[PDB]
Amino acid sequence: TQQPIVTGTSVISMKYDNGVIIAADNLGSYGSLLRFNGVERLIPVGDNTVVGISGDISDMQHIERLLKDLVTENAYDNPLADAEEALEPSYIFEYLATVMYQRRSKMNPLWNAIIVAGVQSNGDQFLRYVNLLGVTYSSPTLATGFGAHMANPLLRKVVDRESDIPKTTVQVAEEAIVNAMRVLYYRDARSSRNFSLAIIDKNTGLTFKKNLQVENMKWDFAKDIKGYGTQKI
């Protein structure tokens, strides 16, 4: 049993017609202190999977190393390591899910919430969640922390059920994700303007976008707001 120290906030994601999108800001918070401003919380595994992690950063870095070691180990005595016997999103997820549930069962959890986004061999979209309790679930949209409360409602307006996935393009999905990240910046006190976004498409492959910023923000209406009730000046 521990407590989280340096933490990363929401990770949000969604499925679209040809793949999945995942995003997460670049902040490492130390309680209310916005301590670290250059933290990458999306970690690619090969060219078909991106693992997005929220929660304790020290445990994230540990998981980051487990995945790096997983790729190394898979290549051992494997002539098809970059082809048929390459790591799949489902393999990577189930590994993590096994680790998370074992650690919680020893009362020494990895204090994280993880979303594994990727595209399988057969072109199928993969999107599944796992956390410190070993709880797992899948949905057309997935989000951690504050993202669950504020991002999912916005992303579910685009893909409300399974049948909406083929009707959703990458431009629409990316737009929804970017808007959701802005909303989180407005309303989440442990979020940052700077974020990373990753797209895993079955045709165009893995696109990893760094140093993205929240833009087109509305603040002008603040000038008119005065006092807390009766004050006019």
Partner: protein, 222 residues
Amino acid sequence: QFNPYGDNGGTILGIAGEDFAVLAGDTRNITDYSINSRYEPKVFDCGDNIVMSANGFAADGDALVKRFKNSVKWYHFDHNDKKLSINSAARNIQHLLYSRRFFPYYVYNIIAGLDEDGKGAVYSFDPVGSYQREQCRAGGAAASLIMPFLDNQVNFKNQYEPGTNGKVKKPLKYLSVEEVIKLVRDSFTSATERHIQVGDGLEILIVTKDGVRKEFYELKRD
């Protein structure tokens, strides 16, 4: 302090017919006041014409099912591909649950199938392994809403024959699969109305001598 347990909501329902059995469950997965998934399968075909659902804390439920599915696999290896009977599966699951008597699987478990005489069978468990064969059982969040309805509409409790005035009971006529599925759908529609953790979808697994069949029905998403 770290709490190793959680509550993923949901509700499950098993009914045994004369020559069939059903195991139903909603597809909604939740934490607190949030929805995780509107479609997260909860009832599984475990092989050998057996269906199972472990409802409560999803992580423990998935682990139990995963372990029992594994127990079935090793039963075939060790005993010459012999079919695991429903009574033998039930006893096996008791030992899986009690192995954690001091750190329990936080789930209400139900299995359904056919007994060795071909009749419909439902078995019910508590989180620590006590089990028994039953005709009717609802488990999970809205179990207390649904069970009385089943006592009334499946076992005809407190129902008497008109004219006699409480002297002669309603006779215990068997139910068809079509009649049972109606009671299942009305049970979940009623539970969806009055319970916030129940909704989104309903998945029913029907077991007969021919095999395992699935039926899906939408539920209210509020």
